[PDB]
Amino acid sequence: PTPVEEAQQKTIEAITKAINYMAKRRIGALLTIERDTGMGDYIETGIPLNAKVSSELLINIFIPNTPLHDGAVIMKNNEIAAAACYLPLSESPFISKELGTRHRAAVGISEVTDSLTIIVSEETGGVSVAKNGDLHRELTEEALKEMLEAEF
Amino acid sequence: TPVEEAQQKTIEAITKAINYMAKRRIGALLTIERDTGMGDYIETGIPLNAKVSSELLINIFIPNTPLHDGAVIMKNNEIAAAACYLPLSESPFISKELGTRHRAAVGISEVTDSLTIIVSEETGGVSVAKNGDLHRELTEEALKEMLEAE
Numbered sequence: 106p107t108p109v110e111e112a113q114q115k116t117i118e119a120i121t122k123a124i125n126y127m128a129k130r131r132i133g134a135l136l137t138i139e140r141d142t143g144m145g146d147y148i149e150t151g152i153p154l155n156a157k158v159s160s161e162l163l164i165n166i167f168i169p170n171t172p173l174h175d176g177a178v179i180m181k182n183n184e185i186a187a188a189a190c191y192l193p194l195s196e197s198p199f200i201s202k203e204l205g206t207r208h209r210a211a212v213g214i215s216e217v218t219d220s221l222t223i224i225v226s227e228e229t230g231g232v233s234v235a236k237n238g239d240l241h242r243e244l245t246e247e248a249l250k251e252m253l254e255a256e257f
Numbered sequence: 258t259p260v261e262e263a264q265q266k267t268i269e270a271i272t273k274a275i276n277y278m279a280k281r282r283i284g285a286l287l288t289i290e291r292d293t294g295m296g297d298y299i300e301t302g303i304p305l306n307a308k309v310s311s312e313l314l315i316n317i318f319i320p321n322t323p324l325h326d327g328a329v330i331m332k333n334n335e336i337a338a339a340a341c342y343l344p345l346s347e348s349p350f351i352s353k354e355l356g357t358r359h360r361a362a363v364g365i366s367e368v369t370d371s372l373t374i375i376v377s378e379e380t381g382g383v384s385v386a387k388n389g390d391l392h393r394e395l396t397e398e399a400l401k402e403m404l405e406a407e
Protein backbone atom coordinates (compact mmCIF):
# COMPACT_ATOMS: atom_id res chain seq x y z
CA PRO A 106 0.00 0.00 0.00
CA THR A 107 1.11 3.59 -0.59
CA PRO A 108 1.36 6.07 2.30
CA VAL A 109 -1.84 7.73 1.03
CA GLU A 110 -3.64 4.43 1.26
CA GLU A 111 -2.28 3.62 4.70
CA ALA A 112 -3.23 7.05 5.93
CA GLN A 113 -6.75 6.56 4.62
CA GLN A 114 -6.99 3.26 6.41
CA LYS A 115 -5.80 4.83 9.72
CA THR A 116 -8.49 7.58 9.27
CA ILE A 117 -11.30 5.03 8.68
CA GLU A 118 -10.16 3.08 11.74
CA ALA A 119 -10.25 6.28 13.83
CA ILE A 120 -13.71 7.21 12.54
CA THR A 121 -15.22 3.76 13.05
CA LYS A 122 -13.79 3.41 16.57
CA ALA A 123 -15.22 6.82 17.54
CA ILE A 124 -18.63 6.16 15.99
CA ASN A 125 -18.81 2.69 17.65
CA TYR A 126 -18.04 4.23 21.08
CA MET A 127 -20.57 7.02 20.68
CA ALA A 128 -23.33 4.67 19.41
CA LYS A 129 -22.91 2.48 22.50
CA ARG A 130 -23.28 5.50 24.82
CA ARG A 131 -26.01 7.25 22.83
CA ILE A 132 -23.71 10.27 22.25
CA GLY A 133 -25.22 12.29 19.43
CA ALA A 134 -22.77 13.03 16.63
CA LEU A 135 -22.66 14.58 13.19
CA LEU A 136 -19.54 13.98 11.12
CA THR A 137 -19.23 15.10 7.47
CA ILE A 138 -16.37 13.93 5.27
CA GLU A 139 -15.58 16.30 2.44
CA ARG A 140 -15.02 14.67 -0.93
CA ASP A 141 -14.65 16.41 -4.29
CA THR A 142 -17.14 19.27 -3.65
CA GLY A 143 -15.43 21.90 -1.45
CA MET A 144 -17.06 22.54 1.91
CA GLY A 145 -15.06 25.73 2.75
CA ASP A 146 -18.20 27.87 3.29
CA TYR A 147 -19.46 25.40 5.95
CA ILE A 148 -15.99 24.79 7.50
CA GLU A 149 -15.74 28.67 8.08
CA THR A 150 -18.93 28.63 10.17
CA GLY A 151 -17.34 26.41 12.84
CA ILE A 152 -14.43 26.54 15.28
CA PRO A 153 -11.20 25.90 13.35
CA LEU A 154 -9.19 22.88 14.48
CA ASN A 155 -7.15 21.74 11.49
CA ALA A 156 -6.27 18.79 13.70
CA LYS A 157 -4.86 15.32 13.07
CA VAL A 158 -7.74 12.85 13.21
CA SER A 159 -7.86 10.49 16.25
CA SER A 160 -10.73 8.41 17.65
CA GLU A 161 -10.01 10.11 21.00
CA LEU A 162 -10.39 13.65 19.61
CA LEU A 163 -13.60 12.75 17.70
CA ILE A 164 -15.10 11.34 20.90
CA ASN A 165 -14.05 14.34 23.03
CA ILE A 166 -15.63 16.73 20.53
CA PHE A 167 -19.09 15.30 20.83
CA ILE A 168 -19.40 14.80 24.60
CA PRO A 169 -22.75 16.32 25.53
CA ASN A 170 -22.94 19.79 27.08
CA THR A 171 -19.48 20.85 25.87
CA PRO A 172 -18.42 23.78 23.72
CA LEU A 173 -17.80 21.75 20.55
CA HIS A 174 -20.63 19.21 20.67
CA ASP A 175 -23.40 21.08 18.81
CA GLY A 176 -23.06 21.28 15.08
CA ALA A 177 -21.09 19.28 12.61
CA VAL A 178 -17.52 18.12 12.48
CA ILE A 179 -16.14 18.55 8.99
CA MET A 180 -13.20 16.36 7.92
CA LYS A 181 -10.89 17.10 5.02
CA ASN A 182 -8.89 13.98 4.08
CA ASN A 183 -6.98 13.07 7.23
CA GLU A 184 -7.73 16.19 9.26
CA ILE A 185 -10.57 17.44 11.42
CA ALA A 186 -10.95 20.86 9.75
CA ALA A 187 -13.52 22.37 12.16
CA ALA A 188 -16.18 21.50 14.72
CA ALA A 189 -19.54 23.05 15.61
CA CYS A 190 -20.18 23.83 11.96
CA TYR A 191 -23.51 24.81 10.45
CA LEU A 192 -25.02 22.64 7.68
CA PRO A 193 -28.24 23.42 5.77
CA LEU A 194 -31.36 21.55 6.85
CA SER A 195 -33.02 19.27 4.28
CA GLU A 196 -36.77 19.52 3.62
CA SER A 197 -36.86 16.04 2.14
CA PRO A 198 -39.99 14.10 3.02
CA PHE A 199 -37.96 10.88 3.20
CA ILE A 200 -36.43 11.71 6.54
CA SER A 201 -38.18 9.72 9.25
CA LYS A 202 -40.46 12.16 11.14
CA GLU A 203 -39.08 11.21 14.56
CA LEU A 204 -35.53 12.36 13.59
CA GLY A 205 -34.09 15.57 14.76
CA THR A 206 -31.89 18.30 13.45
CA ARG A 207 -28.61 16.33 13.15
CA HIS A 208 -30.20 13.99 10.58
CA ARG A 209 -31.84 16.82 8.72
CA ALA A 210 -28.52 18.75 8.56
CA ALA A 211 -26.75 15.64 7.32
CA VAL A 212 -29.19 15.05 4.50
CA GLY A 213 -29.11 18.80 3.80
CA ILE A 214 -25.40 18.96 3.13
CA SER A 215 -25.61 15.72 1.17
CA GLU A 216 -28.05 17.39 -1.30
CA VAL A 217 -25.53 20.06 -2.30
CA THR A 218 -22.23 18.18 -2.10
CA ASP A 219 -20.85 14.72 -2.68
CA SER A 220 -19.79 14.43 0.96
CA LEU A 221 -20.54 11.48 3.20
CA THR A 222 -22.05 12.31 6.58
CA ILE A 223 -22.33 9.95 9.54
CA ILE A 224 -24.97 10.54 12.21
CA VAL A 225 -25.30 8.94 15.66
CA SER A 226 -28.70 9.33 17.24
CA GLU A 227 -28.79 10.49 20.85
CA GLU A 228 -32.15 8.79 21.20
CA THR A 229 -31.40 5.28 20.05
CA GLY A 230 -27.67 5.08 19.40
CA GLY A 231 -28.48 4.12 15.77
CA VAL A 232 -25.91 4.94 13.12
CA SER A 233 -26.95 6.47 9.78
CA VAL A 234 -25.24 7.85 6.67
CA ALA A 235 -26.37 10.65 4.40
CA LYS A 236 -25.10 10.68 0.80
CA ASN A 237 -26.59 12.24 -2.36
CA GLY A 238 -29.79 13.21 -0.63
CA ASP A 239 -30.55 9.79 0.84
CA LEU A 240 -30.44 8.71 4.46
CA HIS A 241 -29.46 5.11 5.23
CA ARG A 242 -30.35 4.12 8.81
CA GLU A 243 -29.60 1.51 11.36
CA LEU A 244 -26.17 0.59 10.02
CA THR A 245 -24.17 -2.22 11.46
CA GLU A 246 -20.51 -1.61 12.21
CA GLU A 247 -19.51 -3.67 9.24
CA ALA A 248 -21.83 -1.75 6.90
CA LEU A 249 -20.42 1.54 8.00
CA LYS A 250 -16.82 0.45 7.54
CA GLU A 251 -17.55 -0.90 4.09
CA MET A 252 -19.30 2.34 3.17
CA LEU A 253 -16.24 4.32 4.26
CA GLU A 254 -13.81 1.99 2.46
CA ALA A 255 -15.88 2.37 -0.74
CA GLU A 256 -15.87 6.16 -0.38
CA PHE A 257 -12.00 5.64 -0.23
CA THR B 258 2.18 42.84 14.24
CA PRO B 259 0.60 39.57 13.12
CA VAL B 260 2.82 37.51 15.45
CA GLU B 261 1.85 39.85 18.36
CA GLU B 262 -1.87 39.57 17.58
CA ALA B 263 -1.53 35.78 17.39
CA GLN B 264 0.16 35.54 20.78
CA GLN B 265 -2.49 37.69 22.40
CA LYS B 266 -5.27 35.60 20.86
CA THR B 267 -3.64 32.45 22.26
CA ILE B 268 -3.28 33.97 25.78
CA GLU B 269 -6.95 34.88 25.63
CA ALA B 270 -7.97 31.40 24.56
CA ILE B 271 -5.98 29.82 27.37
CA THR B 272 -7.25 32.17 30.07
CA LYS B 273 -10.89 31.64 29.00
CA ALA B 274 -10.45 27.87 29.11
CA ILE B 275 -8.67 27.94 32.49
CA ASN B 276 -11.40 30.16 33.98
CA TYR B 277 -14.10 27.73 32.81
CA MET B 278 -12.19 24.75 34.24
CA ALA B 279 -11.50 26.58 37.57
CA LYS B 280 -15.18 27.40 38.02
CA ARG B 281 -16.16 23.74 37.55
CA ARG B 282 -13.18 22.24 39.37
CA ILE B 283 -12.12 20.31 36.24
CA GLY B 284 -8.51 19.13 36.65
CA ALA B 285 -6.24 20.30 33.90
CA LEU B 286 -2.53 20.29 32.98
CA LEU B 287 -1.32 22.52 30.14
CA THR B 288 2.40 22.84 29.34
CA ILE B 289 3.75 25.49 26.99
CA GLU B 290 7.05 24.55 25.34
CA ARG B 291 9.64 27.28 25.30
CA ASP B 292 13.32 27.09 24.32
CA THR B 293 13.88 23.62 25.65
CA GLY B 294 12.48 21.08 23.16
CA MET B 295 9.83 18.75 24.50
CA GLY B 296 9.38 16.41 21.57
CA ASP B 297 10.05 13.30 23.66
CA TYR B 298 7.10 14.21 25.91
CA ILE B 299 4.86 15.25 23.01
CA GLU B 300 5.51 11.82 21.48
CA THR B 301 3.92 10.11 24.48
CA GLY B 302 0.48 11.68 23.83
CA ILE B 303 -2.20 11.66 21.17
CA PRO B 304 -1.10 13.89 18.25
CA LEU B 305 -3.34 16.90 17.50
CA ASN B 306 -1.32 19.70 15.84
CA ALA B 307 -4.47 21.72 16.31
CA LYS B 308 -5.26 25.44 16.22
CA VAL B 309 -5.73 26.76 19.79
CA SER B 310 -9.22 27.67 20.89
CA SER B 311 -10.81 27.94 24.33
CA GLU B 312 -13.45 25.52 23.10
CA LEU B 313 -10.95 22.81 22.15
CA LEU B 314 -9.00 23.20 25.40
CA ILE B 315 -12.23 22.80 27.44
CA ASN B 316 -13.37 19.77 25.37
CA ILE B 317 -10.01 18.09 25.88
CA PHE B 318 -10.16 18.21 29.68
CA ILE B 319 -13.69 17.07 30.30
CA PRO B 320 -13.64 14.35 33.00
CA ASN B 321 -14.01 10.71 32.00
CA THR B 322 -13.08 11.32 28.37
CA PRO B 323 -10.27 9.84 26.22
CA LEU B 324 -8.03 12.95 26.23
CA HIS B 325 -8.43 14.26 29.77
CA ASP B 326 -5.73 12.15 31.53
CA GLY B 327 -2.34 13.64 30.98
CA ALA B 328 -0.97 16.95 29.84
CA VAL B 329 -1.74 19.13 26.84
CA ILE B 330 1.55 20.38 25.32
CA MET B 331 1.52 23.52 23.22
CA LYS B 332 4.28 24.37 20.78
CA ASN B 333 4.57 27.06 18.07
CA ASN B 334 1.09 28.46 18.90
CA GLU B 335 -0.65 25.15 18.34
CA ILE B 336 -1.83 22.23 20.62
CA ALA B 337 0.84 19.62 19.65
CA ALA B 338 -0.64 16.71 21.63
CA ALA B 339 -2.92 15.77 24.52
CA ALA B 340 -2.82 13.03 27.16
CA CYS B 341 0.99 13.37 27.38
CA TYR B 342 3.25 11.93 30.10
CA LEU B 343 5.22 14.45 32.24
CA PRO B 344 7.86 13.38 34.80
CA LEU B 345 6.74 13.49 38.44
CA SER B 346 8.78 15.78 40.69
CA GLU B 347 10.39 14.30 43.78
CA SER B 348 10.71 17.74 45.39
CA PRO B 349 9.91 17.64 49.13
CA PHE B 350 8.85 21.30 48.91
CA ILE B 351 5.51 20.98 47.19
CA SER B 352 2.41 21.53 49.35
CA LYS B 353 1.61 18.13 50.83
CA GLU B 354 -2.13 18.50 50.00
CA LEU B 355 -1.35 18.39 46.23
CA GLY B 356 -1.36 15.29 44.05
CA THR B 357 0.11 13.93 40.81
CA ARG B 358 -1.16 16.69 38.39
CA HIS B 359 0.85 19.29 40.34
CA ARG B 360 3.89 17.01 40.81
CA ALA B 361 3.89 16.31 37.02
CA ALA B 362 3.83 20.07 36.35
CA VAL B 363 6.67 20.74 38.75
CA GLY B 364 8.55 17.77 37.31
CA ILE B 365 8.59 18.99 33.75
CA SER B 366 9.48 22.50 35.01
CA GLU B 367 12.64 21.09 36.68
CA VAL B 368 14.10 19.87 33.39
CA THR B 369 12.78 22.43 30.89
CA ASP B 370 12.12 26.15 30.66
CA SER B 371 8.45 25.50 29.96
CA LEU B 372 5.50 27.10 31.71
CA THR B 373 2.79 24.70 32.99
CA ILE B 374 -0.67 25.75 34.11
CA ILE B 375 -2.56 23.46 36.56
CA VAL B 376 -6.20 23.49 37.57
CA SER B 377 -6.94 21.57 40.76
CA GLU B 378 -9.86 19.15 40.65
CA GLU B 379 -10.19 19.48 44.40
CA THR B 380 -10.49 23.25 44.61
CA GLY B 381 -10.51 24.76 41.16
CA GLY B 382 -7.35 26.66 42.22
CA VAL B 383 -5.06 27.70 39.41
CA SER B 384 -1.30 27.36 39.67
CA VAL B 385 1.78 27.68 37.45
CA ALA B 386 4.94 25.61 37.46
CA LYS B 387 8.22 27.12 36.25
CA ASN B 388 11.88 26.54 37.14
CA GLY B 389 10.99 23.89 39.71
CA ASP B 390 8.58 26.08 41.68
CA LEU B 391 4.84 26.07 41.93
CA HIS B 392 2.99 29.38 42.15
CA ARG B 393 -0.38 28.71 43.76
CA GLU B 394 -3.79 30.27 44.08
CA LEU B 395 -3.46 32.60 41.12
CA THR B 396 -6.04 35.16 40.13
CA GLU B 397 -6.99 35.68 36.50
CA GLU B 398 -4.80 38.78 36.39
CA ALA B 399 -1.82 36.95 37.87
CA LEU B 400 -2.05 34.13 35.32
CA LYS B 401 -2.31 36.62 32.42
CA GLU B 402 0.76 38.49 33.71
CA MET B 403 2.68 35.24 33.82
CA LEU B 404 1.69 34.36 30.25
CA GLU B 405 2.52 37.85 28.95
CA ALA B 406 5.91 37.80 30.73
CA GLU B 407 6.64 34.47 29.09
Ligand SMILES: Nc1nsc2ncccc12
Binds near residue numbers: 328342343
Ligand atom coordinates in the same frame (compact mmCIF):
# COMPACT_ATOMS: atom_id res chain seq x y z
N1 LIG C 1 2.69 11.64 35.26
C1 LIG C 1 1.67 12.52 34.70
N2 LIG C 1 1.84 13.11 33.54
S1 LIG C 1 0.45 14.03 33.25
C2 LIG C 1 -0.39 13.62 34.72
N3 LIG C 1 -1.58 13.96 35.23
C3 LIG C 1 -1.99 13.49 36.41
C4 LIG C 1 -1.18 12.62 37.15
C5 LIG C 1 0.05 12.26 36.64
C6 LIG C 1 0.46 12.77 35.39
Ligand SMILES: [Mg+2]
Binds near residue numbers: 242243
Ligand atom coordinates in the same frame (compact mmCIF):
# COMPACT_ATOMS: atom_id res chain seq x y z
MG1 LIG D 1 -32.39 -1.15 7.37
